Write a protein that binds this ligand. Structure first.
Ligand SMILES: OC[C@H]1O[C@@H](O[C@H]2[C@H](O)[C@@H](O)[C@H](O[C@H]3[C@H](O)[C@@H](O)[C@H](O[C@H]4[C@H](O)[C@@H](O)[C@H](O[C@H]5[C@H](O)[C@@H](O)[C@H](O[C@H]6[C@H](O)[C@@H](O)[C@H](O)O[C@@H]6CO)O[C@@H]5CO)O[C@@H]4CO)O[C@@H]3CO)O[C@@H]2CO)[C@H](O)[C@@H](O)[C@@H]1O
Ligand code: UDP
Ligand code: UDP
Ligand code: MN
Ligand code: MN
Lengths: 337, 337
């Protein structure tokens, strides 16, 4: 029987004592700002199609820029800690190890390599989650009522460092072990969940199943967020970037300017995906430039067009660089107190 | 005539006034710890060599880990800000823009994309440079007396945010503009420098030519460091990694455990390097694993060998993860207090 590790039951007590002992590493970097670690990664070998690595590179730069502006540290995993938890399941052993290794972390923010920040201004409403331990983009009706396999998304979520999360991780991993375990589990998920195709068990479907069947146990501390695009399905967003630039401005994080554009199904690192490769890559270029225009804007540049690698100035240079106006206050934001 | 921008003559005064008006953004994050922005970059298009992008990805993860440990922020540039300053000259306009845009930065630490951290413990001796504005790996005699084009290295250097640095950039760019200017200046460098082959002018050779021919004006504020490998020629390091693991420990930063392994001449991304690609890439894998071992060992893992992507546990899991601090205290080091 697979296990993520030796059972721990007093983790909240171990954290409490550790923080008391090490006040130089508080779990809240500011009155209402918890210490956050964004976690991502990818397989340690080159992508089967070579350009896949290039889009992982653009992806990590994108996360670097957002995290530098919002004062959150990054960890990029390139190792498989548990041979039985490969693929999308590999983030469960990783998350557990980082939680136990960094008790100063209050929230762990996992983000897929195919997800990209498209709103550089938007800051997460931390106080909205002060009484919850797991935050995912989704809808209650889709998860608990319809049991729809896309009622939530596990490519961008927050997990609080607590005993509740360690147990949640244990209740989530059983369908992960590669082979017959994961295959037979997929048959269950396709049968019990709505609209789910037939394939091996994935971490997202397992979360829906767990929450739909054990709501009394977990639902109280799970926050299904649908007010902003903590996760944003690319298939309905990338085409509207021009409309967003024309009518709106960064900071909304929702349908007016999504926080995250997640390219579910594109698989730029594998050989085939669920969508045309041409559309996937061209729209990944557009999403990257959509977010990168907000970075270059601080420095007086912008991409010639949303699909061009080339940039152009947005204003003449000056011998008085400190008088310029930072439109969205990202050069010296309050997130870097 | 080429110019990096409108002439600024009172930057030291502008910066001081700004710092006084913005105490929340000090230029020293702690006593003798200057605020540092590490800056790297690569061309916006996929690598001519397809797998080259996979090694840019590994290189930036390596910098993420080191900078996370030592509390240093990262900027990853993918834009050609000035069409004339293409190639390795692209860092001059980038460095100027970042210094003028971030007055809170005391030191800008440029680092090549083919340069990798192999000592995760070593912290630069900042106090040693309290009176200097430019820090490069090199030797006085080889630069000033011999005029050797490799007497110093511009792939890993510290540049202080100051009027002096702005003036240096003005005196450094003339040989940059692509075309007749760079090609002609290349002939000047091959004729005036020792052992330089024949090719277009490069930023490193130009720096040597400048400092050797104008030592009185610039030399006083330049520190040519050779006590540790701020720049480490891979050719004399990668073969010794296993010896270092046996005999020494991370923290020395020099011949016993180099801070930076820099794969000059390899061109993992471009083409037509000075060394075989196979030998280059396989040693870059070893260099990455040499550094990555120091990261993974915080969490109880290590690479099976410097040539294997697989990892193995260094110790059994435990229900008391907060009793054994890491061997070098990098989980909670003083750089993040
Ligand atoms: O761009 C288009 C054109 O490119 C041309 O190709 C160029 C290429 O552009 C360029 O990037 C490349 O530049 C690198 C060379 O490829 C590379 O071989 C060279 O390696 C240097 C290394 O940089 C340097 O650090 C190292 O220095 C030694 C030094 O030799 C030695 O004296 C010294 O010894 C010390 C002892 O170790 C120490 O114990 C004692 O205390 O002090 C001694 C010194 O006093 O140790 C240092 C190392 O620490 O030497 C190696 C070998 O030279 O670095 C170059 C810069 O990155 O060059 C290519 C051309 O060759 C194409 O040719 C053209 O077609 C294209 O159009
Ligand atoms: O070996 C692996 C496989 C995947 N991932 C990460 O887990 C996420 C989700 O895995 P998935 O199989 O769903 O790939 P996706 O289609 O989301 O790109 C990936 O984006 C990667 O960021 C990883 O770190 N190591
Ligand atoms: O279009 C480009 C080409 C290069 N570089 C950067 O300039 C550096 C030049 O260093 P390189 O390794 O190519 O020269 P070498 O060290 O081999 O002599 C690269 O590493 C990149 O970091 C860049 O920013 N844009
Ligand atoms: Mn994904
Ligand atoms: Mn280099």
């Amino acid at each position: 029987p697979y296990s993520l590790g030796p059972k721990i039951s007093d983790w909240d007590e171990q954290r409490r004592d550790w923080l008391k002992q090490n006040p130089s590493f508080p779990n809240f970097v500011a009155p209402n700002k918890p210490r956050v670690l964004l976690v991502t990664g990818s397989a340690p070998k080159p992508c089967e199609n070579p350009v896949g690595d290039h889009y992982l590179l653009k992806s990590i730069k994108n996360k670097i820029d957002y995290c530098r502006i919002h004062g959150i540290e990054i960890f990029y995993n390139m190792a498989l800690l548990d041979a039985e938890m490969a693929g999308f399941w590999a983030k469960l052993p990783l998350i557990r190890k980082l939680l136990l290794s960094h008790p100063e972390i209050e929230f762990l923010w996992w983000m897929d390599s195919d997800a990209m920040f498209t709103d550089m201004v938007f800051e997460l409403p931390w106080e909205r989650y002060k009484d919850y331990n797991l935050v995912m983009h989704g809808w209650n009706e889709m998860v608990y009522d319809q049991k729809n396999w896309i009622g939530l998304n596990t490519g961008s979520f927050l997990l609080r460092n607590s005993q509740w999360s360690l147990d949640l991780l244990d209740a989530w991993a059983p369908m992960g072990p590669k082979g017959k375990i994961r295959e037979e589990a997929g048959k269950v998920l396709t049968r019990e969940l709505k609209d789910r195709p037939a394939f091996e068990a994935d971490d997202q479907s397992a979360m829906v199943y767990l929450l739909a069947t054990e709501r009394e146990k977990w639902g109280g501390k799970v926050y299904l967020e649908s007010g902003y695009y903590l996760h944003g399905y690319w298939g309905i967003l990338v085409d509207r970037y021009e409309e967003m630039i024309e009518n709106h401005k960064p900071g909304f994080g929702d349908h007016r300017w999504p926080l995250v554009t997640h390219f579910v199904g594109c698989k730029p690192c594998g050989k085939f995906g669920d969508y045309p490769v041409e559309r996937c890559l061209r729209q990944m270029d557009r999403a990257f430039n959509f977010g990168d225009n907000q970075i270059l804007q601080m420095y007086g540049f912008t991409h010639k067009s949303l699909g061009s690698r080339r940039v152009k100035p947005t204003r003449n240079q000056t011998d008085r660089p400190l008088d310029a106006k930072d439109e969205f206050g990202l050069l010296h934001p309050p997130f870097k107190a």
